[PDB]
């Protein structure tokens, strides 16, 4: 139905384009016998939040419904679940983090160096750092959605 | 026809001459889990669309399409 | 040069809100979505619809504005034979005899990056160009392998590649991007001032404005 | 000799085991007309760093001799050098940063909201919390890096 | 009237407890001639904000009226502005972060020196660990919020 | 003696102008039945450090000294210790860190906003973010103390 | 002990949705609102009303069941002394003499952290209490030179403060913490068992539940 | 009657015998912006209430109030 | 079980300082540095050398305490052959007859992980284990193919597949990691509780200690 | 205007290497050390000793270049009378009757920020200029109850305050600073062209300049 | 003579006249642990230094000089 | 003999026969960037040493080894 089609290409649209039973439309249509069915929907749901009333609480609402649905399902591995969210959400894996800063802390050192001596064109002291300034370089992905996530899980 | 991936995939078909392949890819858009805004077809090179027909783009018996994670950079 | 204040709305709107999967162009079997194009914006990584569009806008300025026998390979033909060999990769031109043309273009992506691999059939070598500073003779190499195989079983004829020559691209030339998101331009930006045998003298100041500008040259296919 | 040796396999001890004259050896051994090359070495040279006093030490004059000898070369591109550096750095590039913050905005706001919702098994409050707390989940690394640079930028 | 009321104890029901004339009524009861005001004001009304829908939408149009209008207003210093409200919001100024990092160069290296000795109980290797860890000492702040900010200076 | 005077005005010349002898010598003429002394004495003796070999291992053996004294007192807390240092150093308490987050959802929410709004004069769009990126805004203090320090307590 | 399942939605919905300013007890001239009861949550830092509130619950539970005069000073009471001498602090107490009393207990509040300083008239000496390390030692000296030039101006009697002892209390003997949030407790749970001369034997792993008990006691005013 | 801060302020007055503080406080609140949930009024350490009256809890002339900005610890 | 005090210092120092290339351990042609070693500390992620010899160990402890035909491949085999097809892995494997044994195991390294594919000959079925939650359908089906057309091409005898099975891993059965370190380990321990037929019931809690156990038992070769 | 390149290795030698309380200055009774010294940096912020020197080399130029009567006070002065009443700020002034000069600055320190009040005692009035954006209301009316009753109990003499003014400085009058750090400078630059009746005439640019000069101005004492 | 502090301190004493007081403040530096890099004498104002003296600077029975924490801004 | 890559190389060669290819490998570290502490040499499978020689471990004419990045999980 709408249901199918929604999910392959989903969108803010076609997610109110289903009236009010959207919502529990889904977690029905959705088998909640193996969380990577449930992770890659409750993924393709959520891939609509726009910060409009409309998209926003029609997410929530579709996802309250989504997990009622599966937290009363036996064969459903909550557990699974929250550990293959926090995987296609780079808060878990995606880097060896402890062998990287293994191999920054010698590099750093010498590049933390170099800057302070004199030998150093008095050019790129401002290159260097107006460089580490874009926000390929300043953004911080993972490390931010990681920390919005304790802030509520002390709730508030 | 098939429809070999990149990872090293490649599954196998047949499908209606001048049929809309607007299903051909909805389908194993679901059949991958790959949503198409990810992805994209590309047979021989040139980029299938929706209202194309394996007819008309000209394909025979035994011809690989080719599907291709999105790609960007800068 | 040009900023035509009405030109301007037509670009916020197309930068703006609504649909992700909102149609806003097509052309030579490509539709460009307020999702692809919003990959132009300021600091945003483009992708490879942008990339490959406005390569395409490239042969038609080309051929009507008198300009060299413009062939460009998708961003996803370098990677296919990075990997899968040319067998892999033959067909993929049977509607056009390559050497028949004067100048070749190849969007060379390498995961997260964009650099440009110049062939010049005229002058018979090949350029691989980096808005970075990396330099690329493994990838160079690849390709002329691709070529003279591909005349050779193609037209029977080999290639003397004594007659080939190719090469990097000194940074001190080319200018260089000065942050590690706008090298989807410098990706592009040479393959026109290389496409009409231009002296590629830009910079990252201008850039900025090459991003709103050609949203406006890509929206319309009205390439300036 | 011994130089191209230890530039293979690199190692404090490959690195001592060459008297006063590595520092100076090496940076001659080393062309910098295309700084690829004194990437390469610079990068080889501190792979070896450890915070012992010779090894230490040693890094450093070895560094400064080779930072010297470049610097007063004209083919010398210290541009697309301190460039090449911070991307085999990952500082830059190395990922999407925005379109990756782009694909969390919404899951974020969904898995922040289910935490908070009734139907959320007190179970989990405290085993998402204590998960997001493995080092490879809460160890940040280029983002480290990127600091301690800023960090000398300001000098001290 | 009530809007004074209001403004002494903002709460969102106070704020929903005007019908639709709350938005206009408060940038027009604020005087913007000088951006003390303004932003004291601007602090008042979003110190209401609560995720639901009534109370953030709320506050939206409440403070969208209370911008055009000191934007139009030629006494209004836009520029004091923004820099009053970084303050008063721990993203500018606080504390003199530098003289701070500059007092912990050392006392952070011979503490991530003991911790690697022998001589160190093997005891407090988890309980050191396991005390930077309570929110007190991971939840991070301002740097949350400075971040959240870029983000949408980048806009997505 | 000259370890009493040392302490007053710590400093790394007064702390060399003591031979070999330092080391012990403080250890010894600082009571460790009380970790008050210990970290204020912990403190003032690192409160010198500075890259240099001299001064930096000078720092160490001084240290491991004062370490092991009171590591073989029975009146000595370690606990009270780890955590009178902690906090002299920011790294626990310092400030009511949740309220604050409290205090900025919804401003951030607002503000976050503003910027996004048609009625934001393009003016500040980069006045703004090149605002939050002077170091006293940008430069993360503490939060990089505790990221140093876990780095080592996963050893590497 | 104690959990009973109904009287465990009484709290969750004290510390719940809705108004932040709502009351939700009221006493000793003090009301504990959704705002100020909240900061009994988990890891939360306490205010000033949920603590001057439970240290007024304690003279209540002493008094009617059979336990030594005591009398307690609000949190603002310290500061107030450390600054504006006794003479801005006199009038104070009209309403009451002191030594009278038996047990006296004293908020202290040093920004961000929470001490007490119990003054056992009995005894005729302090004791300064800090659930982390700290010493207390000019934190005490102050407070008795208040009272021997509290009496001495209230009573023209002196104080042979020869008869006075006060001192710190090493972290060995008392429990200490092992965060920096739930300081507020040890705060007041020192403040009970030093009440009832019971022996100070809890840890940091009860307290979360001393946490939700806490807001039960305070909202009935039900001291258990 | 006055309102002595602690910043090192010194503001006085007079009002209403069996008058209603309640008003009293309102006012001084947006006379410094301090607002109320920040900052809590205490006479001799009693807390004043709204309710209350300058003439109930019996205060005189020259009698000086006190006003603290909340504190927290933890 | 045990916890030899002595044996113990012969870890402390070999996950210790000097040489980061030191040799510490030899074997079926691998040599495990003070590098490789390292892998197996806390919280550290493990590399291909500390599997694939823990992964030898178990055949020798097979072989010589009577256990199954214990075949392993490298945990380099999986990826070329999900790229270069049978025919670029063909002579891998020639000194040897597979079906001629009992049990195959396959170290399944997907980039950052660790999964693990178990062929039991005897039951004519593979099972993929992954510790995290992961299932694998695409992996299995790869490597049987490898099979059918394995034999078939080394035996010109087929394999009738109807008669083959395989499948995942329910994650309520099989232990779950309780982090996103510790996998490398999950990876090896089901390789041998499989190995001996043996009921895979082990925690997170226990891990630790088959860390520092694995460094013992992979450095004397002594497989405990 | 100038740079002397050798006077300019004078400076990078002040804000070097080596003693951090050694001395490189002296006079009114101050010795600014390697240390005070260093908060003139970029970025870095100034402290008491920087400012409370800057601040006398003031009072010299204008009486040996023949300026207006300059009286300056203390960092520690509006402090310690925001608290301490003008009782325990009685004595500090005895070595020198005020009226009988023209212009007073007084370095208002806000913990973390830097202000100025200026008295203007030739026009009877007081203003506070502040480099961010605050007002200060409040701190001037301290300062002239300081004043009113400062004559009055050491002349007899009151003070018509209804002949006294003072307000707030607009910040689009005088220049602000575009970040955080650098406000030790306006508050002394204002304190310069406000010492010589000098239109305040300067912005963030020029101010990186300002700090050198203002250590070689500071160091030689050589006040330009 | 006496050594009032800021924190609302008050510790007094005497000492020598034309006496060094170079050690009148090392001493209260360990005495309250407050390093002298932190902390400035300043007696109605005029800093002190080690070379004066109690005598010099002429101060009198009672008289109170005054310790501040060192401050700083931007 | 050759030495294909991972990447989709190809780079060929010969040397002698009973000799220590500890050198044909150092080499092509040197040659390709690559240290050694990142990669490994494998051939048919079975990793090769420094001490081994292509006469022993039985290659041909033709024979093709292989080299890999050095791979990490958890």
């Given at each position: 139905a709408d249901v199918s089609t929604f999910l392959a290409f989903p969108s803010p649209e076609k997610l109110l384009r289903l009236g009010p039973k959207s919502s529990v439309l889904i977690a029905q249509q959705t088998d909640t016998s193996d969380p990577e069915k449930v992770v890659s929907a409750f993924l393709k749901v959520s891939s609509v939040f726009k910060d409009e009333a409309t998209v926003r609480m029609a997410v929530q609402d579709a996802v309250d419904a989504l997990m009622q649905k599966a937290f009363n399902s036996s064969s459903f591995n909550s557990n699974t679940f929250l550990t293959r969210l926090l995987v296609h959400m780079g808060l878990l894996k995606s880097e060896d983090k402890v062998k990287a800063i293994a191999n920054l802390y010698g590099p750093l050192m010498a590049l933390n160096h170099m800057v302070q001596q004199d030998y150093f064109p008095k050019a790129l002291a401002p290159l260097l750092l107006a460089f580490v300034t874009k926000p390929n370089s300043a953004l911080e992905s993972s490390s931010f959605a990681r920390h919005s996530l304790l802030q509520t899980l002390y709730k508030v | 026809l098939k429809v070999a991936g990149q990872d090293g995939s490649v599954v196998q078909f047949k499908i209606k001459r001048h049929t809309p392949l607007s299903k051909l890819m909805k389908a194993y858009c679901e059949r991958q889990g790959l949503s198409m805004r990810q992805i994209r077809f590309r047979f021989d090179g040139q980029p299938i669309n929706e209202t194309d027909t394996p007819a008309q783009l000209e394909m025979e018996d035994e011809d690989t399409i080719d599907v291709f994670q999105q790609q960007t950079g800068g | 040069l040009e900023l035509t204040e009405d030109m301007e709305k037509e670009i916020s709107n197309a930068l703006g809100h609504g649909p992700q999967d909102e149609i806003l162009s097509s052309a030579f079997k490509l539709?460009?979505?307020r999702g692809d194009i919003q990959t132009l914006k300021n600091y945003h990584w483009l992708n490879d619809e942008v990339i490959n569009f406005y390569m395409n806008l490239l042969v038609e300025r080309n051929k009507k504005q008198g300009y060299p026998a413009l062939h460009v390979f998708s961003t996803f033909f370098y990677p296919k034979l990075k990997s899968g060999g040319y067998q892999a990769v033959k067909r993929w031109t049977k509607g056009v005899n390559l050497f028949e043309q004067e100048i070749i273009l190849v969007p060379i992506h390498?995961?997260?990056?964009?650099?440009?691999?110049?062939?010049?059939?005229?002058?018979?070598?090949?350029?691989?160009?980096?808005?970075?500073?990396?330099?690329?003779?493994?990838?160079?190499?690849?390709?002329?392998?691709?070529?003279?195989?591909?005349?050779?079983?193609?037209?029977?004829?080999?290639?003397?590649?004594?007659?080939?020559?190719?090469?990097?691209?000194?940074?001190?030339?080319?200018?260089?991007?000065?942050?590690?998101?706008?090298?989807?331009?410098?990706?592009?930006?040479?393959?026109?001032?290389?496409?009409?045998?231009?002296?590629?003298?830009?910079?990252?100041?201008?850039?900025?404005?090459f991003r709103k500008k050609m949203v406006w040259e890509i929206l319309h296919q009205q390439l300036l």
């Open positions: - | - | 539709r460009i979505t390498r995961k997260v990056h964009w650099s440009l691999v110049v062939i010049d059939l005229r002058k018979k070598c090949l350029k691989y160009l980096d808005s970075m500073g990396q330099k690329g003779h493994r990838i160079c190499e690849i390709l002329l392998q691709y070529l003279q195989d591909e005349s050779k079983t193609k037209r029977n004829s080999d290639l003397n590649l004594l007659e080939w020559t190719h090469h990097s691209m000194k940074p001190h030339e080319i200018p260089q991007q000065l942050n590690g998101s706008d090298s989807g331009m410098f990706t592009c930006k040479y393959a026109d001032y290389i496409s009409r045998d231009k002296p590629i003298t830009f910079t990252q100041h201008q850039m900025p404005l």
